[PDB]
Amino acid sequence: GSSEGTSCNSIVNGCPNLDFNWHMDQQNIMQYTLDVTSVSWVQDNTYQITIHVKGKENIDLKYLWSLKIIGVTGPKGTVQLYGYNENTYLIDNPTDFTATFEVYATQDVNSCQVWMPNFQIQFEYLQGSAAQYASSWQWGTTSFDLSTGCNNYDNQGHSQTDFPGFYWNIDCDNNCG
Ligand SMILES: [Mg+2]
Ligand code: NA
Ligand code: NA
Ligand code: NA
Ligand code: NA
Ligand code: NA
Ligand code: NA
Ligand code: NA
């Protein structure tokens, strides 16, 4: 049984034993982590998800120019979180934030579970007026995208993505099976 708005009980990291750090380390990008902390079924194949993203060290908001979720398969392909040009100020810490948005999840794992469609998070530090803080920037690459997924890894257990992929129950039907 399905009811619109139902929360999924069991959000599954689909590849928790991959090394996701290697991909950031190789690019001189500070490590970040991502977890999918909530999933609920809206209707049809649309789910509302909440992510929590944390950076290894704290980076003050003053250093940030823009931050957006990109490559989303969902009602909106781009989710703006911060940006001066975009006049959007929804997060106050680019190294400890949450975001909530909708995805269309359609690629089934099995008869009960469906994959999160993968996406990226685009960070732009030290651009525009934030460039004034270059003298104290200490965290490596300033302009980068971090990607999710379990579908792209090497033969030595390193992901070529930065964050795991996830799956959950179709329609958040928590008693499927
Ligand atoms: Mg997506
Ligand atoms: Na794994
Ligand atoms: Na529906
Ligand atoms: Na729909
Ligand atoms: Na949510
Ligand atoms: Na803000
Ligand atoms: Na099955
Ligand atoms: Na970028």
Count how many Cα atoms sit within 13 Å of the Cα of residue 176 in the half-sphere of its side chain.
17
Ligand nearest to the CA of 145: 8
Ligand nearest to the CA of 113: 7
What's the gap in Å between 48 CA and the centre of ligand 1?
12
47-64: burial string, b at 16+ Cβ within 10 Å, e else: bbbebebebeeebeeebb
Query: For this experimental structure, what is the resolution in angstroms?
Result: 1.0
Q: Would you say 94 and 121 are in contact if contact means Cβ atoms under 8 Å apart?
A: no
CA atoms of 68 and 138, how far apart (whole Å): 22
Lookup result for tokens 């200490």: 138
116-146: burial string, b at 16+ Cβ within 10 Å, e else: bbbbbbbbbbbeeebeeeeeeeebeebebeb
Strand-pairing partners, residue 79, are 69
77-94: burial string, b at 16+ Cβ within 10 Å, e else: eebbbbbeeeeeeebeeb
Give the max Cα distance, the chain: 57
Q: How many CB atoms lie within 10 A of CB 42?
A: 16
Taking the alpha carbons of 59, 77, 166, 162 in that order, is the dihedral positive or negative? Answer: negative
Which residues, by Cβ under 5 Å, contact ligand 7, an ion? Answer: 110-111
What's the gap in Å between 141 CA and the centre of ligand 8?
10
Residue 59: strand, helix, or coil: coil
Which parts of 7-153 fold into alpha helices (H)?
Answer: 21-26
Q: Which two tokens stand for residue 114?
A: 């469906």
Q: Which two tokens stand for residue 34?
A: 């991502």
What's the gap in Å between 125 CA and the centre of ligand 8?
10
What's the gap in Å between 168 CA and the centre of ligand 8?
29
DSSP string for 132-169: GGGGG--SB-SEEEEEB-SS-B-TTSBBSSSB--EEEE
Torsion of CA 155, 157, 163, 168, to 10 degrees: 90
Which structural technique was applied?
X-ray
Q: Which residues contact 146 (CB under 8 A, 6 or more apart)?
A: 24, 29, 32, 34, 120, 121, 123, 162, 163
What's the gap in Å between 36 CA and the centre of ligand 4?
22
Q: Which two tokens stand for residue 89?
A: 């100020």
Which residues, by Cβ under 5 Å, contact ligand 2, an ion? Answer: 15, 17-18
Q: Which residues contact 59 (CB under 8 A, 6 or more apart)?
A: 30, 93, 94, 95, 125, 139
Three-point CA angle 26, 20, 11, nearest 5° = 160
Task: Give the sheet arrangement for strand 120-125, strand by strand.
Answer: 88-89, 79-83, 64-70, 120-125, 143-147
Q: Would you say 171 and 16 are in contact if contact means Cβ atoms under 8 Å apart?
A: no
CA atoms of 45 and 24, how far apart (whole Å): 32
CA atoms of 164 and 12, how far apart (whole Å): 10
What's the gap in Å between 37 CA and the centre of ligand 5?
8
Phi and psi torsions of 133, nearest 5°: -100, 15
What's the gap in Å between 108 CA and the centre of ligand 3?
17
CA atoms of 62 and 157, how far apart (whole Å): 36
What's the gap in Å between 173 CA and the centre of ligand 7?
15
